[model samples]
Target: HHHHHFNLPPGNYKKPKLLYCSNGGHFLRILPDGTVDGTRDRSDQHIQLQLSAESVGEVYIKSTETGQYLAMDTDGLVYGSQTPNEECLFLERLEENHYNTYISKKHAEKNWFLGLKKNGSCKRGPRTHYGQKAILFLPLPV
Candidate 1:
């Protein structure tokens, strides 16, 4: 199926973006300690994500200022680290409602998604699904 993301930006070069999750009404954030979470505030460098294209539907999310790459571990935990590895690649897919879902490329078969909680916190991959609003996101240019 040729799913066209009409409103989505073509990922190739690095671009600054703030990922907003509908369920939390917050932006995806990375703490200095490498914890990936959702923050109510924007404009912070921790929330400034630079998405680099990896393939047709894949990307590598990195913190612009923190210089860390967002990665999901085998345990389904999302974190930011100084190193970039296979786990840092995410499969970006546009959802029917126009929102986007960042699923772990390494864990695609397991359906591990980049998810957040209602209170603006990161939800472990295994606990998330496309049916949940917590896993839906809108990219905002910074």
Candidate 2:
């Protein structure tokens, strides 16, 4: 019988960094309503993500705020959830500019990406080439 398997080599990873949205020039934050948006300049705990590599090219983005994680639903909507599920996982892809891009693992059918609109709202879109506003991930200053 032929079986396919995959594994990632064990390696050390760096600490989680804050995700600053170039669209709003602010950090990605979770609102009390569980809505995702970008509107914070300084590195607030709410905007800090506990980024962990789960596989060769995948990662989990958990929020320091309310202990919830960032997830994209089937409807291409990004939100915060307390549940431990694959929906909270994302594939960390590198863009042409060398910035990290997050693609939804659960909504890969649509190629959904965690992106910000011109209005500063966080939403998942199939298009991930809208410049820094959609594909750039900046690290917060230490």
Candidate 3:
């Protein structure tokens, strides 16, 4: 796995999907005010987001409703930013469970995991880690 041309599905289509956190059984949402949360009702436009491959092991989760990039701060606050930056880049990875975990690429050194609490709350990336259901998400597009 030296240098593959961005690990992606065939044609690298920008197909959208629902980011479902199995821990809380919630769908992630990009609120109108620019904040993000682990909330949903089956399927909705506000919860629609596309995971596009930017580079090898990197991706950008953009919300179609708000048209904003998913951004996570160094302090562990996650939101929707107007522009794409290092804060919006995430390390797209699949664990042994076949579920995906989005970790901040910019904060890779610090090990930030995109977290979702059981009570439908956003967990701090700095306070999150692997081997937990809170940080696992399934790319469900139905």
Candidate 4:
């Protein structure tokens, strides 16, 4: 008797892959296969990778005190606006891949910065936070 097996080649699968770095600057890698990888680095670092996908759909980022989100699609366009979600505030759209950002007032004294200048995959925590943890800063484009 003979048995048959199936194997899917690369790019043969379709799924959404997302990477999210919080205001605290932690690395959250979501692979196309629906796997989540979380890594932390003490020293400052940046994460970079070429994500393969048919098209990047809606991208949303939110913090505690803000509901509004920043989004971009497969076209590499960026957009943001205030929403009624009461969790986040609408911020500016960054044209550059890397930029600087600050923490929200609700999370004042967080003493954290979104930086993509360091060498390495990515870094997370000592996620410093100040105030009542009301708001958080989103990650910069890297």
Candidate 5:
């Protein structure tokens, strides 16, 4: 017997979501202090994000608190930008564990994924098989 996997069709998911990094063990947050970091508690509104699907498996992530969009530069660094561009777009790949991996649309090198460092800062690196820290996604409460 063989197991077959099916991928869901992507479209506009104009809903809010919480991007929690398994490596950092916190939710993605854009601080007023001009820092894009992660927070352990999800009480703050900065942790909430609005994921707007641009195309199939691609989305534009915006911060609900600061009204900024998540962007990845050519250097493979993640930050919040006021405008959404190619660098701000990400391809959402559904993982086996039911979580999605947000791959940088601009940076296709080594299948880099949006991840967080130990200090709660945003980082992008090559994705590993079965590596939970590299990619994880969760929905925010309505």
Candidate 6:
């Protein structure tokens, strides 16, 4: 099993979201209603995760109990358990309401990047805070 720590502020996390990455596929967890709670899985590596209410910021990673280079969140919860190796999933958030999922084969490679764009059809200022765009990367390569 693996052990990891997460750093979250002392407050309520609203609309909690999750992003995971592994050799398998990516996973996304969203609470649009702001009334969700944390979960734990026995088949997982017992990793801790949390989010921020102000900016939807979050942090999560696999535990370190197993010596395997690849870590998987078996039960999709935050508990210490052992499950099949094919349940690993990677995750990435594209924007405020968007996210990306990644899954690949053995010895997969992963990369993350960010991009920005602006829309010019809005009534707001064009050069100011008109249409804005951003993307997150959570690629899984084999």
lDDT of 4 by residue, 94-132 (tens): 212332132221222233322221231222212322221
> Please, what are the lDDT tens digits per residue for candidate 6 over residues 21-50?
221222221222211122222233222233
Would you give me the overall lDDT of model 3? 0.80
Q: How many residue pairs clash in each candidate?
A: 0, 0, 0, 7, 0, 15
Q: Would you list the rank order by TM-score, best first?
A: 1, 3, 5, 2, 4, 6
lDDT of every predicted structure (CA atoms): 0.84, 0.67, 0.80, 0.27, 0.69, 0.25
Per-residue accuracy of model 5 over 30-116 as CA lDDT, tens digit each: 665546778788687788888887865677888878888887777776778887778888777667646667777776545666777
Q: For each candidate, what TM-score against the reference?
A: 0.89, 0.79, 0.88, 0.21, 0.79, 0.20
| lDDT, candidate 6, at 73 | 33
Candidate 2 per-residue lDDT, tens place, 1-142, comes to: 0111123223234765677767666677876567788865574557777777787678787776677788887677788887768788877765644566777877655567788765668765655543546556765533
Identify the superior model by TM-score, candidate 1 or candidate 3.
Answer: 1
RMSD per model, one decimal: 3.1, 5.0, 3.4, 18.0, 4.7, 16.5
- Candidate 3, residues 50-136: lDDT per residue as tens digits? 778787678898888888999899788998898899899988777654777888887877778888999888888877887889888
1-142 per-residue lDDT for model 1 (tens digits): 1232334444445568899998979999988898889988865668988988867778898898788999999999999989899999988888865788888888888788999999988889899976999999989888
Off-target runs (Cα >4 Å) in candidate 5 are 1-12, 32-34, 126-132
Deviation of model 1 at 91, angstroms: 0.3
The runs of at least 3 residues in candidate 3 whose Cα sits more than 4 Å from the true structure, single-residue gaps closed, are: 1-13
